[PDB]
Amino acid sequence: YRLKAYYREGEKPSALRRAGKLPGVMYNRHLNRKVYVDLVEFDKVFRQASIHHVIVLELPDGQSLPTLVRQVNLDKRRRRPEHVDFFVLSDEPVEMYVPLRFVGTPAGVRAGGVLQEIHRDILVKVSPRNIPEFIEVDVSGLEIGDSLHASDLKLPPGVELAVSPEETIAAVVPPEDVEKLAEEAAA
């Protein structure tokens, strides 16, 4: 995903927001600079890119950079982004979150139940060259009560997790139910 950017300065951050432009910053151990982008454009892009997929920033400097969305400060009270960060990549193994795909109906969910996908993505230390669009996970062997962990992942080539190996990824759990209210009504 590519998206047009522009350099910012003393311009009142608030003022920009009226003009539909949302401020932000791009940075890495080498450089950082004020910027901003058209909100609606960013919205449409970030709706798929988020922090998983890479993002090329087109600055009027003709420069185009391999930035990653580091964080997005939201305004509480009717959620809505205030200001965006951009981690301009390089080549060294920079860690980052990578999405997941819990494929296959679990033993529990099929036989009545519900899968609570804990982590929808996993933080991993990987070279910018390897940007695995996702990681597969056979969440089919999970009967109700079961649970998968990070130590049980389809780790792709050149990739390695940077979280806890014993961390939980997801789990099947009992379903809400009216019959439970009768028993809860007793106690």
Binding site: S50, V72, R78, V109, V173, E176, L181
Partner: protein, 134 residues
């Protein structure tokens, strides 16, 4: 609970912290007006959802009533209200995420959450899960 004693009242300053982001389910109910939500409200709202989609997915309550609510026995003007008639409530500023569902479709989630809105003493909005995760 367990804790210790009856609380002072305190104002409800701006929605500063009062507010979050979906983090457990596919949809969420969020407060727009600030208010103390009674325990018995949480309850009715919660059951209203399970009662709806019977044998449903999973409900997530994300606010817990830890504030002691006081009240006088219909008298004059001294001592502090033993109260607790409503017992306990949780302060809730605008933008704070209350409930989250999961393991159900749109119609299941939309309707069920919407029902909770009518159980709550607040104007509320439903939320998807946009794409915003910090």
């Amino acid at each position: 609970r367990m804790k210790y004693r009856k609380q002072q009242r305190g104002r409800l300053k701006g929605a500063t912290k009062g507010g979050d982001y979906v983090a457990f389910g596919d949809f969420g109910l969020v407060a727009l007006e600030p208010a103390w939500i009674t325990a018995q409200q949480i309850e009715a709202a919660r059951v209203a959802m399970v009662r709806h989609f019977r044998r449903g997915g999973k409900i997530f309550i994300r606010i817990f009533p830890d504030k002691p609510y006081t009240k006088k026995p219909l008298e004059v003007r001294m001592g502090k209200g033993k109260g607790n008639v409503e017992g306990y409530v949780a302060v809730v500023k605008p933008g704070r995420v209350m409930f989250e569902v999961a393991g159900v479709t749109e119609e299941q989630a939309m309707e069920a959450l919407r029902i909770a809105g009518h159980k709550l003493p607040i104007k509320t909005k439903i939320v998807r899960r946009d794409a915003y995760d910090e």
